Amino acid sequence: GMEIHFEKVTSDNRKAVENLQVFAEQQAFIESMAENLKESDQFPEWESAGIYDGNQLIGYAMYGRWQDGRVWLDRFLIDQRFQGQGYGKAACRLLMLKLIEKYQTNKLYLSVYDTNSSAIRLYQQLGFVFNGELDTNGERVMEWTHQ
Amino acid sequence: GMEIHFEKVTSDNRKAVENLQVFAEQQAFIESMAENLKESDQFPEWESAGIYDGNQLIGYAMYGRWQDGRVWLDRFLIDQRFQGQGYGKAACRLLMLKLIEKYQTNKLYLSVYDTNSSAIRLYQQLGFVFNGELDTNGERVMEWTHQ
């Protein structure tokens, strides 16, 4: 029969959870995004942004200053209707420039999963490099230092 | 040409952002989930859990006590390989019981998007009712009171 139970997330299962298959769960994604927005709205340190080309919403980003004082790109998405057309690179570059304008720092941080080859390539082309650190979710950290 | 810019999220665009089309962006979802886990790990008030049937990971939940003291189901997902087979209801019921066991309260809260008919039906069958409130992301709030 069913044997339903719940486990805390640890290194033993975190990557299995990160790989939960939620393909085509359209309504589920709406709730996921609504919860993202609830969280950024409440936490003074976090900020959500719609990414536009003119009047068309083409993506989403969440970013800001964590503790101790590092500025992270936390979430970054391009709508599937508009992927493969240069928007991710152009928007990510602009956001990077906006963030080092806003904050005193010249460094930005993000982390990536190991199978995410496109993301690694995009971030590398923009100047992020692996910095030898692991984030708390086990992802490898990348860092952009603006000279 | 491209006219890339970023907008703060407000009532004017929040529902457009919630409806960002990210169907089939498998690698993107991995990063979304990894960021969910990073956030729950750091915030003493939030908790992530893998949902299992025996040894098989079948879903994910994030929950906990917000401010002022309300206990929320913040994220709840069943893997697409296992949807339509009674897992959501069985796991959601068990989590509800675990939460009122843990906390002194007898009330649990969640919010839903208006088009999410399955979710509304599942939560209603488990005893959640609309309570006349709007969450900060504009979603209608539901409440379960345990007598």
β-partners of residue A5 are B52
> What is the separation, in whole angstroms, between the first and last Cα of chain B?
60
Q: How far out from the chain centre does Cα A85 lie?
A: 19
Domain boundaries, chain B: 1-43, 44-147
CATH number of B44-147: 3.40.630.30
Question: Contact A37/B18, CB-based, under 8 Å?
Answer: yes
* B103 burial via Cβ count (<10 Å: 0-12, 13-18, 19+): middle
> Mutual orientation of helices B87-102 and B117-125 as an angle, nearest 10°?
50
Cis before residue A41, ω within 30 degrees of 0?
A: no
* Experimental approach taken: X-ray
Which pair of tokens denotes residue A105?
A: 């720092």
* B3 interaction partners in chain A (CB closer than 8 Å): 52-54
B1-43 shares its CATH topology with B44-147:
no
The closest of B52, B69, B50, B70 to B60, measured between CA atoms, is: B50
Q: Return phi, psi of residue B16, to 5°.
A: -65, -45
* CB atoms closer than 10 angstroms to residue A84: 9
Q: Is B123 a catalytic residue?
A: yes
CA distance B30 to A90: 22
Question: Contact B42/A3, CB-based, under 8 Å?
Answer: no
DSSP letter, residue B86: S
> Position of tokens 């719940």?
A6
Contact predicate B86/A31, CB 8 Å: no
Which pair of tokens denotes residue A145?
A: 């230092």
Which pair of tokens denotes residue A71?
A: 């500025």
The closest of B106, B94, B104 to B144, measured between CA atoms, is: B106
B85 shares contact with chain A (CB less than 8 Å): no
CATH top-level class of B1-43 = mainly alpha
* A20 interaction partners in chain B (CB closer than 8 Å): 29, 33, 57, 59-60, 77, 79
CA distance B139 to B131: 12
CA distance A18 to B37: 8
Contact predicate A16/B57, CB 8 Å: yes
* Residue type (1 letter), A19: N
- Three-class secondary structure of residue A103 per DSSP: coil
Q: Return phi, psi of residue B112, to 5°.
A: -135, 155
